Write a protein that binds this ligand. Structure first.
Ligand SMILES: Nc1ncnc2c1ncn2[C@@H]1O[C@H](COP(=O)(O)OP(=O)(O)OP(=O)(O)O)[C@@H](O)[C@H]1O
Ligand SMILES: Nc1ncnc2c1ncn2[C@@H]1O[C@H](COP(=O)(O)OP(=O)(O)OP(=O)(O)O)[C@@H](O)[C@H]1O
Ligand SMILES: Nc1ncnc2c1ncn2[C@@H]1O[C@H](COP(=O)(O)OP(=O)(O)OP(=O)(O)O)[C@@H](O)[C@H]1O
Ligand SMILES: Nc1ncnc2c1ncn2[C@@H]1O[C@H](COP(=O)(O)OP(=O)(O)OP(=O)(O)O)[C@@H](O)[C@H]1O
Lengths: 315, 265, 580
């Protein structure tokens, strides 16, 4: 189109929009935004997809969350993403559902479940999450997409991926003696080179290794996770407000660098969500009142092995 | 009515004549069917369940309820006609014969305006008169707008294989699950059905016999589903007793089950 | 015209009469249809989209707009006629009847000049006359001498229209997308005026918002603008039948009946039962307080409305010793939720040792035998969206099989071989594992804490981190104590007494007999199975000997006592005495 002023300014601050849902991971967001802006400005390579990324790194850090956020930004809904879930493509013969069965065999009329989706919507985001656990034949097939931008299905038709953004999220890659992130990056790169063929990686536009979440990022993400619960309660005509003590304690208990943000999620689940569910069922807190969570028996700095959350319902 | 009578069977008339077996314990399913039939658009329930759980018995019970007048005002005195696609496709040899018959049936239904179609084995409606233009394609405009009340019935596997492969038709039918009744519900069903089987076999069936039939059928027979799985034992025990000769007891049911499955019970 | 009326339905006349439903929010689609219809050549738009999204509604709205007059000067007074292929084919017994009819219709359209055809279900046009109608129409479509609209599903379009490339080239595809939740709320607000009038009820804004949101969230095989209207219509019909207002509670009840997912409001009895859920589960499970508490917390969170809309209702790994109740807890949970142990979807992972058995879960790919049969798990979950799934002894499955369930645990979705996506967002997944049970070498300084550490280490060793990370809880079961064994003797004896009472015999055990049974059948390492074997050998065998020997018959109150014991009775003997 002719990029309007509103659309142009939205594109210019794409990083801000993506970071509203993604905490940290500045490099990955920058790379995705740069690819999208380059495509929109009209400087993209005409004979290659709009972008090809390999997200790798620690678990529970936002490799697939970034894909979902990008799809939401581009199309306004997370469901606009095309997710393949490569975990179930272990078997060699299971590639026929990406491109369809050959003519004359059962189920050939239905085509493929990837080529058809891309053909219907040429401009779409495709997510091959957990690519490392698919069979090698799938990698050989996708080599063609990466190199030429077109893929041949069972019927023989060619579907063009030139206007598509491909994201492969992989968990690949996850100290003897006296000694006094870059190490993780090098290990991940070595594992990727070992697993994938050199030319397959050569065709990838970018390979990004995600940083482990830090304490400040967890503090920020506490609010993001609590927003879901607050919105869910809003449907019941009840508002949830956590004092700074409650947020600080939630961050303190849920912070563990190795396992990412999931521990924080389950901490929110078992610390406030279940207690709120019990209280709602018992009717200690009901519609029309605000629920304030607070913390007691906590000095504010030391670990809260004794601190306990307290809920107060005020009209 | 002549065109309908040669391509279908009046279930309400049969219920009035008492040709349909009693239906016991399906109050909720019948109520749900009536609720779907009273809708404004897409008022086409489809009864889905395992084979033998009482899909056709539900429609027969609905016909009986209509005859008794217990139905709401909307379904009052409506005539439930079961359509037989075999009759429609029988004489259709030349081009346009099947379509002409189906159009005539629909026009008659519309003119009368007090008819509810019933299609058991609804999966046969997909690609009936052709591979294309068939019964489903002709009916789709009528079904979508709610101008033609219809009650389909299919099994789970047949629904998945045939109906779901045609999304446009599958969108126009509201699934109404019918589940395999528990053992207590089966015992109630057998107690309700006792009279007809006693009259047919001229034998007496004890309450212990019904309890044993339900329990043993649930426990041992594996590939069947309880209502018919137990009515089979009752009916076969009655048949044995009549052949030999006049009472049916738990021992006779156990003998029937032993012959069936071979388990020495 | 006469021929057009005979073989078609005048949509403009219906719109003038007000027989068409209002169309809301499809201004862009109607505008694009108008643009394509006004072209110089190939002015033949075709609306392609998923079923129920409003393809026919777009044409109905276009007819309404033409009737009103909010259209360009090209279509100021055009008459929109929906064509009936069945009417054309029916009665064409002879060789030239169908072609004659189609030629007459086209000649009438050309003469009148102001008619716009609408071929609903365009895919059916390929072989209508089999010369088929597609071949007859093809020359007219290309040159723009016949303005025609078409409508087809994406699948039907691909399967039938795209086969004939020449025919496909002559139709301009117009994409009609599934409306969003807000668009659906607007549509429901528009349609309320007619739906409530037909049902003679009142529909509140909360009811329509709830209908749209619930239909979007819970019904996955339908498409939004139609599923929401179905919910509203069913609620209205229920209100009309029972006797009036329709609120969100009615829509929730309708959805609960439809899909089986318990979204309706909680009654006093139901909420009281939920609050005492631990006590209800402890009627069958003895001990294992932590696991029962965890399961009850998950179910209460699901029912209270605090569930995460993305992830399943709860994922647990029940590990620990053997015979302590790992599978029994899942069976009791299924019984509590659905009232029958058979409601549990049990997968015995022991049979999944070989990797090529993974296709047993989501079926075979396209072009292979068994492709049409789907999967064992996906279909079972589809039929019962709200269910308890039990992966029994997951540690025995191939490493490549538990790697296929990551999307199930995190995203709550599984795609079968046919491409259908089955949601697991309402199920409860329980993996029972026995790792770290076979089992200190050097000098060593509770035992439960050591067992828990060993089990957790074994779980980490076997499963990859990305699998254990996605699981809501990992619960290690305690070993059964003497008091729990004494309590469970009552359960096992009740199991036996039910069978005896089926024979009109009542079994009574003196407290001495229960104490001796607990003493003989207590081995902490082996769990509760030794107690079952002891009750089987000491009671069931003796009772069977007695029954077959006619010593005790129907109507007798069998009583079991211990004679040569006082309170380790290796010499103790059980005595069975019957009285009327
Ligand atoms: N950087 C992040 N920003 C915001 N939320 C995050 C972030 N990382 C994780 N989360 C939270 O963790 C949840 C899941 O994280 P995610 O699946 O994206 O990690 P992952 O890279 O896929 O790990 P893996 O695939 O190896 O299991 C998200 O729903 C989200 O709520
Ligand atoms: N609620 C019921 N009350 C009385 N009888 C019942 C009931 N349900 C089933 N029966 C009996 O079960 C038997 C078989 O049930 P039914 O006629 O519904 O077969 P079906 O559901 O159509 O199976 P399929 O579609 O696979 O052929 C009938 O004889 C019928 O009398
Ligand atoms: N924009 C809309 N405004 C008002 N109602 C709508 C709108 N879109 C859809 N509906 C409703 O969707 C319902 C489903 O009918 P629809 O128009 O979608 O037929 P269809 O798209 O041709 O379906 P099929 O693919 O089976 O032919 C209509 O009854 C109509 O009430
Ligand atoms: N805590 C328990 N409470 C009640 N009954 C129990 C309990 N534990 C065992 N039982 C009895 O043991 C029998 C089987 O127990 P169960 O299958 O649950 O052990 P398990 O956890 O599966 O051990 P494993 O799978 O490693 O062999 C049940 O019939 C049940 O009656």
């Amino acid at each position: 189109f002719k990029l309007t002023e509103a659309e142009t300014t939205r594109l210019l601050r794409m990083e801000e929009e993506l970071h509203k849902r993604i905490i940290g991971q500045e490099d990955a967001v920058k790379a995705v935004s740069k690819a999208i802006r380059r495509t929109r400005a009209g400087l993209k390579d005409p004979k290659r997809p709009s972008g090809s990324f390999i997200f790798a790194g620690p678990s529970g850090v936002g490799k697939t969350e970034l894909s979902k956020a990008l799809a939401n930004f581009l199309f306004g809904d997370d469901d606009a993403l095309i997710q393949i879930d490569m975990g179930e493509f272990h078997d060699r013969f299971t590639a026929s559902r990406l491109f369809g069965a050959p003519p004359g065999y059962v189920g050939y009329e239905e085509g493929g479940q990837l080529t058809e989706k891309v053909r219907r919507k040429p401009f779409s985001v495709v997510l091959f999450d957990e690519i490392e656990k698919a069979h090698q034949e799938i990698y050989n097939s996708l080599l063609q997409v990466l190199e030429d931008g077109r893929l041949t299905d069972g019927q023989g038709r060619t579907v063009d991926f030139k206007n598509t953004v491909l994201i492969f999220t992989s968990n690949l890659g996850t100290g003897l003696g006296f000694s006094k992130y870059e190490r993780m990056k090098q290990k991940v790169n070595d594992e990727l080179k070992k697993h994938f063929r050199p030319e397959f990686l050569n065709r990838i536009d970018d390979i990004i290794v995600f940083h482990q979440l830090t304490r400040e990022e967890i503090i920020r993400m506490v609010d993001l996770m609590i927003s879901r619960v607050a919105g869910q309660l809003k449907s019941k005509d009840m508002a949830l407000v956590l004092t700074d003590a409650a947020k600080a304690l939630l961050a303190k208990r849920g912070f563990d660098p190795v396992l990412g943000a999931r521990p924080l999620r389950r901490t929110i689940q078992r610390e406030i969500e279940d207690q709120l569910s019990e209280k709602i069922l018992f009717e200690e807190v009901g519609p029309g009142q605000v629920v304030t969570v607070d913390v007691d028996n906590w000095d504010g700095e030391g670990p809260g092995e004794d601190a306990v959350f307290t809920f107060t319902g005020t009209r | 009515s002549l065109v309908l009578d040669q391509f279908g069977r009046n279930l309400t008339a049969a219920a009035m004549e008492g040709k349909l077996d009693p239906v016991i314990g399906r109050e909720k399913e019948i109520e749900r069917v009536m609720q779907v039939l009273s809708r404004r658009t897409k008022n086409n329930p489809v009864l889905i369940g395992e084979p033998g759980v009482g899909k056709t018995a539900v429609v027969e019970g609905l016909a009986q309820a209509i005859v008794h007048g217990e139905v709401p005002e909307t379904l009052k005195d409506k005539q439930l006609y079961t359509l037989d696609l075999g009759s429609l496709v029988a004489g259709s040899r030349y081009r346009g014969d099947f379509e002409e018959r189906l159009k005539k049936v629909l026009k008659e239904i519309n003119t009368r305006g007090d008819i509810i179609l019933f299609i058991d084995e609804l999966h046969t409606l997909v690609g009936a008169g052709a591979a294309a233009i068939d019964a489903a394609s002709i009916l789709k405009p009528k079904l979508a707008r709610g101008e033609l009340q219809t009650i389909g019935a299919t099994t789970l596997d047949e629904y998945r294989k045939y109906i779901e492969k045609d999304a446009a038709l599958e969108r126009r039918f509201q699934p109404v699950q019918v589940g395999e009744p528990t053992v207590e519900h089966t015992i109630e069903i057998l107690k309700g059905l006792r009279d007809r089987y006693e009259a047919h076999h001229r034998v007496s069936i004890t309450d212990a016999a019904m309890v044993a039939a339900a329990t043993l059928a649930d426990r041992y027979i594996n590939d069947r589903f309880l209502p018919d799985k137990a009515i089979d034992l009752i009916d076969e025990a009655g048949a044995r007793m009549r052949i030999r000769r006049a009472e049916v007891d738990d021992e006779q049911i156990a003998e029937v089950l032993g012959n069936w499955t071979g388990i020495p019970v | 015209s006469l021929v057009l009326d005979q073989f078609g339905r005048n949509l403009t006349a219906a719109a003038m009469e007000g027989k068409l439903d209002p169309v809301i929010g499809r201004e862009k689609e109607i505008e694009r249809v108008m643009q394509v219809l006004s072209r110089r050549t190939k002015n033949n738009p075709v609306l392609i989209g998923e079923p129920g999204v409003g393809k026919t509604a777009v044409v109905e709205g276009l007819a309404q707009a033409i009737v009103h007059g909010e259209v360009p000067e090209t279509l100021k007074d055009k008459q929109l006629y929906t064509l009936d292929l069945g009417s054309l084919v029916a009665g064409s017994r002879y060789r030239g009847d169908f072609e004659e009819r189609l030629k007459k219709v086209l000649k009438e359209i050309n003469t009148r000049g102001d008619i716009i055809l609408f071929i609903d279900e365009l895919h059916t046009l390929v072989g209508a006359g089999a010369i088929d109608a597609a071949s007859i129409l093809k020359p007219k479509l290309a040159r723009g001498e016949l303005q025609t609209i078409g409508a087809t599903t994406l699948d039907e379009y691909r399967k039938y229209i795209e086969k004939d490339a020449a025919l496909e080239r002559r139709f301009q595809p117009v994409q009609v997308g599934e409306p969003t939740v807000e668009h659906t709320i607007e549509i429901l607000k528009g349609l309320r005026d007619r739906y409530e009038a037909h049902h003679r009820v009142s529909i509140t804004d909360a009811a329509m918002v709830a209908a749209a949101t619930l239909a979007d969230r819970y019904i996955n095989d339908r498409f939004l603008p139609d599923k929401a209207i179905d919910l509203i219509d069913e609620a209205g019909a229920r209100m009309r039948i029972r006797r009036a207002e329709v609120d969100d509670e009615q829509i929730a009840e309708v959805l609960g009946n439809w899909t089986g997912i318990p979204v309706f409001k909680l009654t006093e009895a139901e909420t009281t039962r939920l609050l005492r859920m631990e006590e209800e589960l402890h009627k069958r499970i003895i001990g294992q307080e932590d696991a029962v508490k965890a399961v009850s917390k998950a179910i209460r969170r699901t029912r209270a409305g605090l569930k995460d809309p993305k992830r399943p209702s709860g994922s647990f790994i029940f590990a620990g010793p053997s015979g302590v109740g790992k599978t029994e807890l899942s069976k009791a949970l299924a019984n509590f939720l659905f009232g029958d142990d058979d409601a549990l979807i049990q997968i015995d992972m022991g049979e999944f040792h070989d990797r090529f058995t993974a296709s047993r879960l989501f079926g075979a790919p396209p072009g292979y035998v068994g492709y049409e049969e789907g999967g064992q798990l996906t279909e079972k979950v589809r039929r019962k969206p709200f269910s308890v799934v039990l992966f029994d002894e997951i540690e025995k499955a191939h490493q490549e099989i538990y790697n296929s369930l990551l999307q199930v645990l995190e995203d709550g979705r599984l795609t079968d071989g046919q491409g259908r996506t089955v949601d697991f967002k309402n199920t409860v997944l329980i993996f029972t594992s026995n790792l770290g049970t076979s089992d200190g070498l050097g000098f060593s300084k509770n035992d439960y804490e050591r067992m828990k550490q060993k089990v957790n280490d074994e779980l980490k060793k076997h499963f990859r981190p990305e699998f254990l990370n996605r699981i809501d809880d990992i619960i290690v079961f305690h070993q059964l104590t003497r008091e729990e064994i004494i309590r469970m003797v009552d359960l096992m004896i009740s199991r036996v007494a039910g069978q005896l009472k089926s024979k009109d015999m009542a079994l009574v055990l003196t407290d001495a007999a229960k104490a001796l049974l607990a003493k003989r059948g207590f081995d902490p390492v082996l769990g509760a199975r030794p107690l079952r074997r002891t009750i089987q050998r000491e009671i069931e065998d003796q009772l069977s000997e007695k029954i077959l020997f006619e010593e005790v018959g129907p109507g007798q109150v069998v009583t079991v006592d211990v004679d040569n014991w006082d309170g380790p009775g290796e010499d103790a003997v059980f005595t069975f005495t019957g009285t009327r």
